[PDB]
């Protein structure tokens, strides 16, 4: 997250921190995700496509810090790693959506707590009007030039951009589809960045906090005329329902 503010997991208790174990024991951070039901985390396919083996991955819930434990956190193995079969990429990733069925060593799913809660899915094709302010959350870079990720969770606010504005040649042209949502700061001063992928774009829709988007792609970060691009969750409900059933 470029700009924005530090936070803790209490302010985004559906946030899932996803890590990969390397040949040799090393564990590195992969991406964010969102808890949509006790046993199911939703994320982005691009996060996993090069390493599709479920056994590689560790998922935490209730975690506010990148490389230290948060009191009350839960740790999970990935029982099933489901990638979208129509995924494609040339930068602008299509169908960038993934599901992780989580299961602890004791064979259990998420248990809701002050730090662990689910986020509601939107109604189909029901998104906020463009210009609406939404929030994004993640452990990604604080500056495009940084080498390190922040140790503390961050969040910021971005505004939704019309498909018409985003499809302009001087924005993204035809790289952006109707199954994607653009969002940016009016001054281009805050944005998602590398490491924020897979995490939640949450909007308040009819008084309900709703998982409107999943961090997907962008050209650089916090750059003029280059919004963040998010998978439009409201266009994937049958896919989600079928694969979680």
């Amino acid at each position: 997250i470029i700009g924005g503010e530090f936070t803790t997991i209490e302010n985004q208790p559906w946030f899932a921190a996803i890590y990969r174990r390397h040949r040799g024991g090393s564990v590195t951070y992969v991406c964010g995700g969102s808890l949509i039901s006790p046993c199911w985390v939703i994320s982005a396919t691009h996060c996993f496509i090069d390493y599709p083996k479920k056994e590689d991955y560790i998922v935490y819930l209730g975690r506010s810090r990148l490389n230290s434990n948060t009191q009350g956190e839960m740790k999970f193995e990935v029982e099933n790693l489901i990638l979208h079969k129509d995924y494609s990429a040339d930068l602008a990733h299509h169908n960038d959506i993934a599901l992780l069925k989580i299961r602890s060593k004791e064979g259990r799913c998420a248990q809701p707590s002050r730090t662990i809660q689910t986020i509601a899915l939107p109604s189909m094709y029901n998104d906020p009007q463009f210009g609406t302010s939404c929030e994004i959350t993640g452990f990604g870079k604080e500056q495009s030039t940084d080498y390190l990720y922040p140790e503390q969770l961050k969040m910021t606010v971005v505004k939704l951009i019309s498909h018409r504005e985003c499809q302009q040649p001087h924005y993204y042209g035809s790289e952006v589809t109707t199954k994607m949502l653009c969002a940016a700061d009016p001054q281009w001063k805050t944005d998602s960045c590398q490491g924020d992928s897979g995490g939640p774009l949450v909007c308040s829709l009819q008084g309900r906090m709703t998982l409107t988007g999943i961090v997907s792609w962008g050209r650089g970060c916090a750059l003029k005329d280059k919004p963040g691009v998010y998978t439009r969750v409201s266009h994937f409900l049958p896919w989600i329902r079928s694969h979680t059933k």
């Binding site: 990969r20 990429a89 590398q194 992928s197 792609w217």
Partner: peptide, 12 residues
């Protein structure tokens, strides 16, 4: 490779 889309990739 230094931004969103190529996280956890073998090229990067």
């Amino acid at each position: 490779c230094s931004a969103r889309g190529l996280e956890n990739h073998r090229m990067c």
